[PDB]
């Protein structure tokens, strides 16, 4: 009976950084939406983290956000020949702030916003954010409408008001064209989990509600009293 559980705790089950978003943004003139890359902060994009959160109804944690920003070189002509290091800027936007329309905008100063400048060839950039919500818990399921007359959106997409992370390059790149990809990682710590609930049997299809297709319970075996194999797979 001296086999107690340490790696089954609520911390070690949830203190592992999972990838949440995959962005892509170039560094050239023309098509200004390709220069920056916006993302409203969900946890519902990637599945590998979503199933771990949707075992509990409510949560409350502090987080550790990290970014592995890597870049390539775009094909074609007029390439760099030689290229200094290129730095990236990650800006958080709170709910209700002014967003930049494009790159080199007026609003990229970020006096109040917690921007962070990161150089390539270094360690991945890291920050900590506390339990930030108006409510007392990050509710993973909200069985209720938005308006009191029962219209509007339905589901968890009413208390997910966490603003956006808008990333951009801060070099002009006079000669060449080069994309970069952003990979956001969430590692929640000091986690508390309330009201457990079953895992999702059906596959995920949306990031707005709990839509699903009716799937089978388990896989099929041969008979009611099938014991599998009596000897190995040979002969």
């Amino acid at each position: 009976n001296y086999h107690s559980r340490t790696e089954s705790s609520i911390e070690n089950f949830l203190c592992r950084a999972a990838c949440v978003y995959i962005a892509t943004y170039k560094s050239a003139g023309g098509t200004p939406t390709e220069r920056y890359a916006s993302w409203r902060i969900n946890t519902r994009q990637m599945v590998q983290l979503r199933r771990k959160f949707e075992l509990f109804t409510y949560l409350r944690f502090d987080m550790e956000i990290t970014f592995v920003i890597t870049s390539t070189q775009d094909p074609g002509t007029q390439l760099a020949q030689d290229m200094p290091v290129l730095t990236h800027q990650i800006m958080y936007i709170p709910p209700g702030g002014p967003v930049p329309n494009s790159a080199t905008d007026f609003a990229w100063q970020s006096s109040t916003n917690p921007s962070i400048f990161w150089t390539e060839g270094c360690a991945p950039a890291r920050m900590s954010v506390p339990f930030i919500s108006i409510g007392n818990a990050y509710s993973n399921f909200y069985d209720g409408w938005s308006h009191f007359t029962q219209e509007g959106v339905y589901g968890f997409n009413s208390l997910n008001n966490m603003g956006h992370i808008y990333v951009r390059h801060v070099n002009e790149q006079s000669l060449g064209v080069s994309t970069s990809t952003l990979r956001v990682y969430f590692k929640p710590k000091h986690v508390r989990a309330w009201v457990p609930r079953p895992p999702r049997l059906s596959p995920y299809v949306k990031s707005s509600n709990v839509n699903f297709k009716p799937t089978a319970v388990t896989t099929e075996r041969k008979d009611i009293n099938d014991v599998g194999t009596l000897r190995p797979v040979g002969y």
Partner: protein, 285 residues
């Protein structure tokens, strides 16, 4: 400062917090080791369950008031103790052989009964614990089973993908929506298949939520004393469902030729310690 502790194998570790924020420290990851029947009289309407039957007290906790220690309201008008505590009886659903299942949505299922739909129609906020008691009259030659479960925040998926759901199809006014043993083909209705329980989870895995069994052999009724579970302490009852009952028969009822075939099922909920806040002269509808 200068702390020393133990690690999971003398051996120690000295970690200091170098930052002025509580959410900037590392993760903790360390532990410091003719017959007698009971009769619930609530309000002015009693029940009679059994002497031998267990009563499931929610998620461990009894339903209680919201004290001044954890209130965020401005002014707190009165809560009634007799006017809204009665054992209100809803409509009687009828159990047949091939009956799939039934569900309810209780903050929007008591809007017509008594003053519970006459207090929450005026006040903005709301908070109440519930004392569900579901019963079916048994006999010794009427084999069959039942499962009740009060799932909290039972977000239900729509029948057709890239659609929302409609309030007419999610809840009903006095009736319990059936649980098609097959798949609904609707364009705006709910995906009401019975082997996925609406939410998409496995229907065998509904036993985490407070649950009780109404096995016709050894039980006549079932009583779940559910507590108020919500993140925010107070939220309006017309745009939020606190939980959801689900009565799913796992074993179908099989009578004989000379036996009764109209076995009913009733639900007799009763709100415990119902509090209200924010009186606005509204009269919602």
């Amino acid at each position: 400062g200068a702390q020393v502790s133990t690690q999971k194998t003398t051996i120690h570790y000295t970690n200091i917090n170098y930052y002025k924020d509580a959410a900037s420290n590392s993760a903790n990851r360390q532990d410091f080791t003719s017959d007698r029947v009971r009769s619930i009289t609530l309000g002015n309407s009693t029940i009679t369950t059994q002497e031998c039957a267990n009563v499931v007290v929610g998620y461990g906790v009894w339903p209680s008031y919201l004290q001044d220690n954890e209130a965020t309201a401005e002014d707190q008008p009165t809560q009634p103790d007799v006017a809204t505590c009665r054992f209100y009886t809803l409509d009687s659903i009828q159990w047949q052989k091939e009956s799939d299942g039934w569900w309810w949505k209780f903050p929007e299922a008591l809007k017509n009964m008594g003053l519970f739909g006459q207090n929450m129609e005026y006040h903005y906020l709301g908070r109440s614990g519930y004392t569900i008691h579901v019963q079916c009259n048994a006999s010794k030659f009427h084999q069959g089973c039942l499962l009740v479960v009060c799932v909290p925040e039972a977000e239900m998926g729509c029948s057709d993908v890239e659609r929302e759901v409609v309030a007419a199809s999610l809840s009903s006014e006095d009736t319990a929506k059936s649980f098609s043993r097959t798949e609904s083909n609707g364009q705006h209705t709910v995906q009401t298949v019975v082997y996925n329980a609406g939410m998409g989870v496995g229907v065998g895995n509904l036993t985490i939520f407070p649950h009780q069994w109404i096995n016709l052999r050894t039980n006549n009724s079932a009583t779940i004393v559910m507590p108020y579970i919500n993140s925010v302490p107070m939220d309006n009852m017309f745009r939020h469902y606190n939980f959801t009952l689900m009565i799913i028969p796992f074993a179908k009822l099989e009578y004989t030729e000379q036996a009764s075939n109209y076995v009913p099922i009733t639900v007799t909920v009763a709100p415990m310690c119902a509090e209200y806040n924010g009186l606005r002269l509204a009269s919602h509808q």
